Amino acid sequence: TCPFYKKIPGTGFTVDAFQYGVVEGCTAYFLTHFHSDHYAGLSKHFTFPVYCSEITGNLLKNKLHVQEQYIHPLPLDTECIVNGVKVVLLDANHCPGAVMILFYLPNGTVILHTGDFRADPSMERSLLADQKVHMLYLDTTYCSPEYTFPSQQEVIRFAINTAFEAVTLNPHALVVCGTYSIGKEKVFLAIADVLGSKVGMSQEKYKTLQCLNIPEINSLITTDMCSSLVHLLPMMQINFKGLQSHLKKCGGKYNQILAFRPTGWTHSNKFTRIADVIPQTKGNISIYGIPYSEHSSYLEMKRFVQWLKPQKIIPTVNVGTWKSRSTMEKYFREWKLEAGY
Ligand code: NI
Structure with a gap:
């Protein structure tokens, strides 16, 4: 009740x-x-x-x-x-x-x-x-x-600098960002902006974002995945199996994935500074857990x-x-x- x-x-x-x-x-x-x-x-x-x-x-x-x-x-x-x-x-x-x-x-x-x-x-x-x-x-x-966690600003700075470095070293790298609800849009939009790309996503997610009164949104997002090097996927698919899979789908356009999982808190916050975050890597796939909190x-x-x-x-x-x-x-x-x- x-x-x-x-x-x-x-x-x-x-x-x-x-x-x-x-x-x-x-x-x-x-x-x-x-x-x-x-x-x-x-x-x-x-x-x-x-x-x-x-x-x-x-x-x-x-x-x-x-x-x-x-x-x-x-x-x-x-x-x-x-x-x-x-x-x-x-x-x-x-x-x-x-x-x-x-x-x-x-x-x-x-x-x-x-x-x-x-x-x-x-x-x-x-x-x-x-x-x-x-x-x-x-x-x-x-x-x-x-x-404890960092400001939203310090976290976005980390992500923009990481993505920009990775893609300028390897122009055939793909960036993937996980999502399961609205919120945390700044993560993927800020990364797309520094790369000069739009963010590619499913039709259901594109519809969701079009409800939100974000300025210039038609300029930052798209449902054409082929024309984008920042892809949004369900948070469930942000793991080595799900990302190898997705990479196969891109048909040899890309040879590396850098993925971001914006979690709430995770225990490495007690010890680690944002400057000191490292990915989990397997092969040509790296995944960064970043502490972007909206609480x-x-x-x-x-x-x-x-x-x-x-x-x-x-x-x-x-x-x-x-x-x-x-x-x-x-x-x-x-x-x-x-x-x-
Ligand atoms: Ni909530």
Whole structure:
């Protein structure tokens, strides 16, 4: 049944709660972003109002065939009224179209649901700075101090320099980038840009990217694989078997693959610097795992919460075990005592 942490008290609202059937007493279903653990259950047969960003509403219509009359897209950074309650959508710094939601309850409580986010200091100068937040529904994916990772910028720098070196040394090398959802587009687009190529992909993935309002997108992507030296493939195919296979398909146009797997965190983060990342190589195939995260590091999350000073925190990730729950609650108390709220 619908967990409490998907329900917004004092409203008839739910957040990312599409897999429970009809939630009893829910008059509006918010969707923070287009990732499957969050949209699970939406289809053309859904007949309740869904509130979301423009981008997320393009994906609902075009990819899941939700009928237009049930999609209620909202502009960002704008006070809007939904079933008599003031709300604001803010950028979540996650994937394209991902939002955080501010709810201004009739009784005077203010609630921020982060959806999935990567906390950033730029958030300290949105509409959040203007008033106090009593309850925080927090993306806790990496709420433990072992989770450090580089900035997105340092990671993209590493990838651009690696790819550019490899292809200038060998103009017959192919670059492959793995994907399984939206998000992380900068990886493959930045690499294609430095190489003077478009990114070649399947028709289903090209359709997905055309929903996202990226500027100049017709200039960076294509479904003609033959004319491209940066190919996007399902993350499942980013392994030695899958890449040998794919290489055979290119018909002797290429004699080497350099592949990128942008993971979340992986334990080499505890030791290794970005400068010091190396591939796994077999034959004429190399695979780089790069730590491109679209969730907060532990330290980014701590800063955000210590700035915001909420009165109550409700975790939305890693809530299924007692040892996780208990550990998270201990960090929340540490942060509150160190900062004095
Ligand atoms: Ni997500």
